Every structure is written in C-alpha cells, then in structure tokens.
C-alpha cells in the first residue's frame, strides 16, 4: 500500500448579495473577515502537521491535493 | 423546520515545499493554477444554484457559511 497526506479544515465565511424577483442571487461579494488570503493560510497551516522521515530531506517537492469543501448556512 | 442553503465544491491544488532533516515541512508556496482568486470564485459559483421565491426580492442580504474542507494527496 502507499501512504497519503491529509487535510481537514473547518471554517466560516460571510457573503453579502442581492436576491432578484425571478428568485435568483446576484451581485455577490465576500465579506472577508480574515486577512485576504484565507483559504491559503489554512492550507499551509495544515501542512505543518505533515510528517516525513528524518535524515532524508529535499527541496522543491511538489504534490497535488484533491479536496472536497462542504458548506451550509448557520443559525437561521 | 427550517431550510438551509448548501455548498459542495470539488477541487485541486498544487503546492511546492522543502522537507527538513528533522522531517518537517517548511518554505511552502502554493502553485496557483487558476486565476489568484480560486476558493472565492468556486463559492460565488455555487451560489448561482441557490434558489429563492419569486416576487419577494431584497438587497444587502447576509449569511455566514460554515464549511468543512477535506484534502488528500493524489496519484502517488
């Protein structure tokens, strides 16, 4: 078998928008509550926790990460 | 009961970093493959799909969205 590396972030986000009479959203803006880079910082953070074997280092290592985000509105 | 609104994004992301001899990651940068705003565009996108009842519109509506991101490295 082969060992993967994993990510699990929990988060929040605030969005303002208009609702039209047809019943469709428009004119969305995010209210960014964290410093502009929000998604990015939470990722780099989760890679602190990543472990490798000592005495075999390197640089420029690359990886692609497939992720699933799963939102849902809060506290009516 | 009360009706929520939901989000489900699937995505990818590329990251370059160093691995030290202690066995810890350092010097992380994202390789941003989509236009800088990646997380943001995928969100605004998912709110296209949101439905409201016609003939009751408004503007400046705000909502907070709690989300769970769940990564894991690809194709060894």
UniProtKB/Swiss-Prot annotation, chains A, B:
Family label: Belongs to the TonB family.
Disulphide bridges: none
Protein name as it appears in the record: Protein TonB
Disruption phenotype: Cells missing tonB survive hydroxyurea treatment better than wild-type; further disruption of mazE-mazF and relE-relB yields even better survival.
Tree of life domain: Bacteria
Subcellular locations according to the entry: Cell inner membrane
Assembly: Homodimer. Forms a complex with the accessory proteins ExbB and ExbD.
Whole sequence portion shown: 164 to 239 of 239
Function field: Interacts with outer membrane receptor proteins that carry out high-affinity binding and energy dependent uptake into the periplasmic space of specific substrates such as cobalamin, and various iron compounds (such as iron dicitrate, enterochelin, aerobactin, etc.). In the absence of TonB these receptors bind their substrates but do not carry out active transport. TonB also interacts with some colicins and is involved in the energy-dependent, irreversible steps of bacteriophages phi 80 and T1 infection.
Induction description: 2-fold by hydroxyurea treatment.
Ranges where the TonB C-terminal domain occurs: 1-76
